[PDB]
Design a protein around this nucleic acid. Sequence first.
RNA 1: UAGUCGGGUGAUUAGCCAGACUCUAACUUAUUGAACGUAUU
Lengths: 308, 208, 217, 220, 220
Amino acid sequence: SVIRGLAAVLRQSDSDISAFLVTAPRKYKVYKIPKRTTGFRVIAQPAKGLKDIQRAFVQLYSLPVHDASMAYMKGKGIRDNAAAHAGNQYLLKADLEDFFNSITPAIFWRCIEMSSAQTPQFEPQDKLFIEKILFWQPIKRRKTKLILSVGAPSSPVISNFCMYEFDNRIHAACKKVEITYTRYADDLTFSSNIPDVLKAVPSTLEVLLKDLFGSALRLNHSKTVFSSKAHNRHVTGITINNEETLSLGRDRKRFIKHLINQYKYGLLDNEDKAYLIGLLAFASHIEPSFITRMNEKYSLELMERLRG
Amino acid sequence: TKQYERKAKGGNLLSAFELYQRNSGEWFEMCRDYIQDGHVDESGIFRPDNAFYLRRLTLKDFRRFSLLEIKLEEDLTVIIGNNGKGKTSILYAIAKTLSWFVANILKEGGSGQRLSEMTDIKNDAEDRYSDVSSTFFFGKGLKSVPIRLSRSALGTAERRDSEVKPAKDLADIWRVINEVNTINLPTFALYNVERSQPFNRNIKDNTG
Amino acid sequence: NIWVEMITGSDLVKVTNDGHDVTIDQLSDGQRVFLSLVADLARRMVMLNPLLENPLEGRGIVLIDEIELHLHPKWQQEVILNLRSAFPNIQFIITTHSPIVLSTIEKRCIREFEPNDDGDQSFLDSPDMQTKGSENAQILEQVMNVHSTPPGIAESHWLGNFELLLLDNSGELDNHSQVLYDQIKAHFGIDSIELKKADSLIRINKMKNKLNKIRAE
Amino acid sequence: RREERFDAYSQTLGGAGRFDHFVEWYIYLHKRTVSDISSSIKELEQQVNDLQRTVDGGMVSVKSLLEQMKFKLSEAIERNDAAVSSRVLTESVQKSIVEKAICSVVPSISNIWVEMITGSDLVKVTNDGHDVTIDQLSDGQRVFLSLVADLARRMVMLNPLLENPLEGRGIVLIDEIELHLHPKWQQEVILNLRSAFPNIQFIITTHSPIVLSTIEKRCI
Amino acid sequence: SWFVANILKEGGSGQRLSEMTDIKNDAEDRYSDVSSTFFFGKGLKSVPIRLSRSALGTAERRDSEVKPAKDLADIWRVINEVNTINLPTFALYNVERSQPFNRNIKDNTGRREERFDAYSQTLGGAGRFDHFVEWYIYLHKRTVSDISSSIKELEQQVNDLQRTVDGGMVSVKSLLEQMKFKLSEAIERNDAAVSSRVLTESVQKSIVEKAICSVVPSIS
RNA sequence: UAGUCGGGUGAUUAGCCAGACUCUAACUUAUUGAACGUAUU
Ligand SMILES: Nc1ncnc2c1ncn2[C@@H]1O[C@H](COP(=O)(O)OP(=O)(O)O)[C@@H](O)[C@H]1O
Ligand SMILES: [Mg+2]
């Protein structure tokens, strides 16, 4: 049935879809992306044919996603995520270990079985094809190790779904004690105005993770961080200032001003100019007031010339 | 790259060092000044502009500890408790972590020490592995250097990996910069109760 | 002072210890162990900090377990101050059982285990009491949870019991209180702190009773 | 060598004790308590009798084996007789005495026993309510355990005729009694030692005012 | 040393260069290299090996390159495991070989009979003439003895013991099982010896005697 | 006191100025994929 649906969407024969899927878990290109300090991240991207199938699958089958999930959501993003916590004085951030690569077919099917909200029902015959669509085989010789790859177009949807029940439970628990909760992919954020309630959240998380996923998904204990208005507070790379407003942060703003000053004296190369323009668009989205101030500081004419 | 150049010009040490390694003057001097720059305070004491200290330590299923977190002072931290509270365990854990800096200052890709599979995992831990997580600070250009030492219990099928690359990356900066032009180097030392020993003047170490 | 002599035909390190010239082998274990620590540390700092005017102002992390090991109480009162003065940029992480050591250290530097922990405490914290410049007896009780007197000795309870007896008999020295008073006097002596405290209790209770009688009339 | 009575004098005045000798001796005691020597003699006697019957029945090939078994039997009887001749406390009683002494004097230790783990004998302790190996003990606990265990072993070996061998005579020297002890232990240590070893002359050195608070000025 | 280690054990390590003694004192590059090239027929004309060591604190590590030697040694090891082959001899005889003879010769545990005892201490500089004497006496005893006579004797003893157990003496069942195990072990050792395609002890003796007498002029 | 937030200045990722904050307590991260902002069509 899954095959027939995909074939219809992609205007291909059932036979050619089925044939392609036999070795689909191996049809991934692996490459490295530089980290911002030292080192690299290793990324696996599906081949074009497989990407098309994955996108078709996600189109055909709607999986439930909790409202606290902010990543990969139509019409939402990092601004909305940060804004959810801007009014609270105390902040807790937690992180999940090897989030995407921890999600296996076993976890996926367990989530389907456990799901409260109306999941699509799959025929047992289709289960094998679905696994081949959604999961990557990193080790050639070990056919038994299938995992989600962050580089796949279906992985965001599947990961959000797998966290649906988790999000339900923790959201409900937090609401009872006046804690705001949001999740951006593997990044969990908790905020409150009540002192000495966020301390219990990490223990609650560990229990819930064990209950739902056993040992498959775990907290990164080194990445559990408490903050308050006494210290720097950021959420997904957006600074929350002490006036409870979203900000780019002082250092980033000063850097932008530096680039504008360089542009004013024709010192910016084309690459840096392009860079500046892109940054200003983002700045306009997070902190429109900053753009107003730059217009005031630098002549509207200069800024228009830059953005033209 | 332009991204590294921006970060390096912003005062990031790791980016400056990466640029030095690819182009192998400007970047070398940035790295060397980061390590060497300092000032003499009112009391006549030299103070480095970029201080180096252990910020935080986390212990998971290590010896008696299920999950413990410690925040350390930049200057002096004193740990007190009854016998058997784990005061020595804490210093052991730190020393093993510091061994990774020492090993990599001495030799590229050197090996530091390990948690014992025989003794270091908590006896009643349901998950049969232990983690010692440390975060080090080295000035505002390198605010966080995270290290994790891990070990699974003897005979467990799933082995838990240590994460030591950040220690190696920092120790590499010290080693490489020193080779080109001498710099001052950090001292790491552990003095446990084994320091009490009978003296022998006649016994010489003929090794190094 | 410390110096090397070669004249005998073997190389000998000598020290002036309490005004006497001795060999390192002649030092007490306490002196030798502490000398060893400082000597070792200084050597390493000198070797690793060739560009500093004072190489002992270099950076590093030093861990010392049981800092009070083999030290007389007199030395325990100096040791942390001396180390921090000599090595001003080292991060020291220390363990101790000594209230005398703690009396020289700020409470912010102290991390205390909870008394009935059993190894599920999430975070270590400072003591509530300020330790730096505090009396030893207070540190013992407030920070180290140890009574000022040994609980397993009967005589340790006599002054407490004496006070209770005074309070039970409306402040008058009865036959029972007198017996215990005499026992305290006999055991601790005529000029003992314990007896003086007993005397003080008698005097204050007599005065309180006189007030009470005046008020009743 | 560790089961010989005068091993109690081995390295007695060397300063460290021999805690390794204690462990060996204690495991030995445990193995002997799990296996009786007379049953082995009875079993060996039965084997010798069975082998003698086979030799009497014309099987001359087993004569060499009979002679070996007779030797083993004679040795077992001699050991039994020597044990009998030494007029010694039973191995079970010896074990119990030492265990009680350790648990009474060492505050963190409530129990000590020998486990067969894998294929090698291990001494385990209940320390602060948790079962641990000796190698898991803190330095303070281990050092103090070592002192008491060693002393108890030697007293048991040297005082076989006493109902309580720890009530024997002797002179024990201890340098820096407070070594590695928290103040709470320092308040108990002299009391515990004197209670366990009532007839020993103790000559000790200390830097601890907490220790001195438990002692009469005449002793100082 | 790298060939010997890898013939004996998969992933065996040979000897490293010393950082203290092997590096030239005034080397600008602050590292040392020992590069060797071996030949093994026209199929393997070049087997390069490099031992390397850098000084402490150098910006780059200099590691040894030993894989080709290991690969070759692995061929010898693996092929030999399946079907016995002849193996290369490596030996070093330093001035140390001039040492006095310890006459009092040690009890044959039976390590000396093992084929890969031939690699024991082979590059230590002295040889092991003590091992020779033990092995040579061992060879003599085996030559004077019959082969499988112990097995035949053990077979006879197991048969006699089996008859006793069949006759109703259940007490000797434990001894029978032990003796059956000893017999099986003896057969296995004999079979392993048979499987190891080794020369008879008499022939081995003769070869060595002839060699010694031929090479050493004063010895007939 | 220290750390943090950051309105202004400043050929400007620095420095300087002003104002404020303090649950034991931020460490600024990752693409070609996904989402969002901008540009184009
Ligand atoms: N693997 C382990 N599992 C459980 N408890 C352990 C383990 N290792 C050590 N312990 C316990 O930890 C304590 C050791 O304390 P230690 O680290 O020496 O600190 P301190 O010097 O304060 O006594 C003892 O209570 C010992 O029983
Ligand atoms: Mg992009």
